[PDB]
From a paper:
Crystallographic studies of AcrB have revealed that large substrates e.g. erythromycin bind the proximal pocket in the access/loose monomer (access binding pocket) while smaller substrates e.g., doxorubicin and minocycline bind the distal pocket in the binding/tight monomer (deep binding pocket).The proximal and distal sites are separated by a short “gate” loop (herein defined to consist of residues 615FGFAGR620) that has been suggested to regulate the progress of substrates through the export pathway.
Both gate loop variants also show well-resolved electron densities for the substituted residues. Overall the backbone atom positions for the AcrB(AAA) variant are similar to the wild type gate loop, while the AcrB(ΔLoop) structure reveals the gate loop deletion to be remarkably well tolerated. There are no obvious structural distortions elsewhere in the structure for either gate loop variant. Strains expressing gate loop variants were both found to be highly susceptible to erythromycin, when compared to those expressing the wild type (MICs: wild type AcrB 500μM (or 367 μg/mL), AcrB(AAA) 125μM (92 μg/mL), AcrB(ΔLoop) 62.5μM (46 μg/mL), AcrB-negative control 31.25μM (23 μg/mL)). In summary, we have presented two AcrB variants in which the gate loop is disrupted, either by reducing bulky side chains or by removing it entirely.
Numbering used by the authors:
A (entry chain C): 847 to 895
B (entry chain B): 2 to 1040
C (entry chain A): 101 to 249
D (entry chain C): 51 to 100
E (entry chain A): 300 to 348
Write the structure that this text describes.
Amino acid sequence: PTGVGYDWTGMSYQERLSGNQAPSLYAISLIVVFLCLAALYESWSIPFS
Amino acid sequence: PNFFIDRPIFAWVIAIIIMLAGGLAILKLPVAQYPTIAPPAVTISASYPGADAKTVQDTVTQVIEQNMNGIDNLMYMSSNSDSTGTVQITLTFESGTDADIAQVQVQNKLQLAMPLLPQEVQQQGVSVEKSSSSFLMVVGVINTDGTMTQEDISDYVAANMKDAISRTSGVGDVQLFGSQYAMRIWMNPNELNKFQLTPVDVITAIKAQNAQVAAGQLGGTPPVKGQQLNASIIAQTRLTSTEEFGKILLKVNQDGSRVLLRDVAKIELGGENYDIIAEFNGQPASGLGIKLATGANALDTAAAIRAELAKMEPFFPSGLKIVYPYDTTPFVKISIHEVVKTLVEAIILVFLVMYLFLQNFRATLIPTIAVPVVLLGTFAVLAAFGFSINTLTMFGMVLAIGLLVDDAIVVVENVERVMAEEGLPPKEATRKSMGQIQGALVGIAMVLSAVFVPMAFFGGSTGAIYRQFSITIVSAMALSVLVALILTPALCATMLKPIAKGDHGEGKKGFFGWFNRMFEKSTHHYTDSVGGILRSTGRYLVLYLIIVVGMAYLFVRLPSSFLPDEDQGVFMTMVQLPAGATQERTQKVLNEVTHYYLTKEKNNVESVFAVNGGGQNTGIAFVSLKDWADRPGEENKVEAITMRATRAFSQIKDAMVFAFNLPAIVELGTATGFDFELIDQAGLGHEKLTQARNQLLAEAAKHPDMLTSVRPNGLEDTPQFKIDIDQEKAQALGVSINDINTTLGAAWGGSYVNDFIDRGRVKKVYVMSEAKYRMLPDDIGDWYVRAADGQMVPFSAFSSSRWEYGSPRLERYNGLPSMEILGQAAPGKSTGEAMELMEQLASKLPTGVGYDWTGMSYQERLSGNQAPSLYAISLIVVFLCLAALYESWSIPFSVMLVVPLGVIGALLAATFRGLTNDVYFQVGLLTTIGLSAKNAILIVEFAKDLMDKEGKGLIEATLDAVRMRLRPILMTSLAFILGVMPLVISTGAGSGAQNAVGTGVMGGMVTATVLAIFFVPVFFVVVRRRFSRKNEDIEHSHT
Amino acid sequence: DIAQVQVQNKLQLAMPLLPQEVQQQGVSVEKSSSSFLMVVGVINTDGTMTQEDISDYVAANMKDAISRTSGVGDVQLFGSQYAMRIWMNPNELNKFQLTPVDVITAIKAQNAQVAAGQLGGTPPVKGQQLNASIIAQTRLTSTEEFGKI
Amino acid sequence: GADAKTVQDTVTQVIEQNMNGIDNLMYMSSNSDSTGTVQITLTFESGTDA
Amino acid sequence: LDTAAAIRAELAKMEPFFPSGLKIVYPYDTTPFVKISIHEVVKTLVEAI
Ligand SMILES: CCCCCCCCCCCCO[C@@H]1O[C@H](CO)[C@@H](O[C@H]2O[C@H](CO)[C@@H](O)[C@H](O)[C@H]2O)[C@H](O)[C@H]1O
């Protein structure tokens, strides 16, 4: 009924945390690797390739 | 550097990364109006019901000032002992101490003296609190139907909202203003003398019939073997209603009928205490003071608290509505809105200059990219070092905009300048040009951070204040020189368009460049001229000395504020009734004040909070004003508002009432002025010291040419009421003195006796006299004390009564008896001098009359001997760095000599606006100096380069140099002064700052550069004439 | 600091289980030294005063601000502060039919402050004009007034 | 000797209103027993100074 | 050496409100030694230069 909600805590809280962390983490990490290659290698292309 | 010219995209990558660290830093960057600035203060508060000033000073105040030994980093200890029975001891610690550790040490030394306190104090509370007087917001609570009083609303407040406000995001401390529902029994004296009863019986029976009892449990361990049942055994449950307390027994008569509580007194859920009485526009109200969480954003906490109350709005009882007296937040949104507008605006202006001078969209696109970055990164390094977006940090940004604007400009310019001069394709041009300005750039970085780090190391609140700017600006400057060394040269080599040798695009533009000629012509005019002013020198040295001396005179004749007072959307008008006054009179003058603001300020005043604030004797009104867009004019602003209000309450009253606007940062050293503390040190009487204070009243009032407005900061003695109990007569009749005093006490002050439990919240239970039977001294006759053998004795049988004098508010300083004395320096004179004359006057005072400083006068007494040492370090570090950059111990003087030329024009205009030598003015001063020196440096170096690496003469060289350095100096100062312009001519929110910064700066830039482009080569050329014969002249060499 | 406060914390778990003589005579928690950092001496050349007078001056004018210096662990006082000292006469006590108990209880009665009160105290009556302090049983200041006990 | 709904609206709920402005707090959870016990657990941001 | 200097300022401050003839004396203090002892290491370093 109305106003009866849910949560995870302890164990399940921290795992909701790793879920919530997955996408941004491959986002940031993937985008860094990009910069680093475009930087070491003077190319815009090698990063897309 | 040279490196990135060929590695542009490496440059872009670092740019990007600084940007994303920046943008990230910016998305999640805290905001408040000002950063934490005040030394840590913890106040211990406790109340002793019924007590007078000396009772709380001499039973509790002192037991704590004796047990507060060995706590880390004590700065000073200061206590009020109010006749309301409350005692408040303020411990301020060394600036930058762990707030928390301090407080816990304090709370624990307290928890150890706790057994040497009286019993009422122990049960009434001793609290240890961090004392920031800065509440993020005050929400007022009202009822449209006017259904309830204040005590009801108040209890509602304590019962429903503080829970859901304190759960709101960003809300740190939540505080309750008012008295909750407590069980209030108003005794009836005649009704009690009736039945052979005293307050003793009242209290004692009340204790019997209302508590819980050490309960017990069935099947309890260890049970018997094979046991079966185990559950809770309910005992004496605390009483729920008045209706049950009426029926509690006080005395059984012979003929059986019982005498209940209901009989002898009026019984009601009442207020816990009724000293403080509040109206929001005449409608009764209670209030909440919300403090922002630590490391929290102010504006969201505002918006969240607001959505939180708005949802709860429909479940408010009949007619109750939420209102807003106080909110630092909307002003914060608008000041910040205006700083962003500025930074962006200066960017647009730089664009307009760069275009309308270099007239090529790509060139103008570069600096456009440079600053957003330096901005972001700066935002980031400050994010890294953990600052916040406050007035000090953002205006610390504005002040550095000139350095950013200039760093980018110098480079793009010199490059273009090189192509236009020589006809290299863009790259080789940029390499050449970076080649020209590189050594300078690292140099400038070193001289700039040489004037900006020393100001960081200042001490106390002022030093904090400075550290904000110092760091803000070293970061902006740092990132901008690097951007200048890494990206921008690469941006030039890349997106910059080649310009034909000997171009200058002279004329050609029928529609446009009818200007380029004008500027070319005037540029030779210019060279012509400067050579002429090196042709004879003397005049211009005199002229210089003139300017310097003027610089100084003006300097002396300048005012010294701390921070400008700003129209902050709210202010307060505080009220003081004559000594001895009552609630109703004070209250009267308040209703008159309130109605006045609502009358003769109908177009302005939005709302008034009247706080008849215990003690009675004083009252106070917190005042709200409508949004800034509906108070446009000059007479509609706080200046005028407060003036017309003090005009109102000046003559026409029997009570003194002033109306004022607040300092910006709440805990402000009042500029010219001081906090003197006069201390008693010999086992001396309060009498003697008060009379000593009178003496220094006479001695400081006799010196108007130094000191101005010297005052005590407390409430003077008032007459009090002495009731001398003939103990003999009491031991005679057989009455117990414990019973006489404890009954008397219960009668006029009251006694906290029990707790009760209403609706599922535990609340207090007091017992006092009904109003009308404890008011005027004759009421003493109305009360009775029963002996051990059982008979009634009126009080006028065993006591004598009289009037006398006493002090209601007993003050202490660092453990000893003292009297606090505020004061400021004569209209012209300085605080330091005044403080000195105060020492010479107070030196006239008695043995056991010693003196000391605190707070404002403390902070101002120690870290003010730092100014000269820090600018000594600055002069020497800056000098040493330049001595390195040029290869001379002497040439540095040719650039250090410009420093007055900018300073002079700043104070000029600053006096012409009659502003004040404040922080904003001063960091401005530096900034001004700083660019004056950068440009001086670029010119000096260019000259020298010509002399050396080309073997050009000295005079020709200076000419050439200054010539190639004319076009940029102008572009920048042009851009700057033109972006800054709005700071000077802007009102709207908070523009006291905007103007204060802007003025000195703009004036500064005008005289700075207008002087620079003539005095620099003079400075150079003369100073350069204290060096070697052969070489001299010069013009051969060998590359 | 942290240590001091955890230890002081377990000490609060022992505090209501300690007697009142102990509680009111003083329990102290110190992160202090092993030995003496220094010893400050207080004297009088002319010998105008005895020694206990000097001592009183030491706990009355001086000791409080020394134990508050930042960085000072403990102060020890070589001597005692002035306290109102009553030395009973035993035979004199059997004489008048009295014991030390009477002494204590009576001394408690004739010497304290008391929840006094206020004329015009809130809530006053409508149209009230007076609001002032009611002075009560004052604690006794001198030896002589202890004589009359 | 006290009961549960007694300890919670006299001791527990009184404490959770003073736990405002505690830094690096993740979640708050409290038990209120008639065995005489009342118990409050504050779990904090991962890595907070204990 | 610092707690020392602070106790000096507090005491020097307390001197004047003392009664008739009172004087402070110095029986014990580890400090003058610390200062003067490290000071002789200094005289050394310099003369040695
Ligand atoms: C912002 C763009 C820059 C262009 C602005 C040009 C205006 C210059 C304003 C102030 C500079 C002083 O201007 C200059 O003063 C000196 C006088 O010492 C003149 O110099 C002249 O006078 C003195 C004698 O009086 C002679 O030794 C000198 O040979 C002679 O040519 C300059 O020819 C004159 O132009």
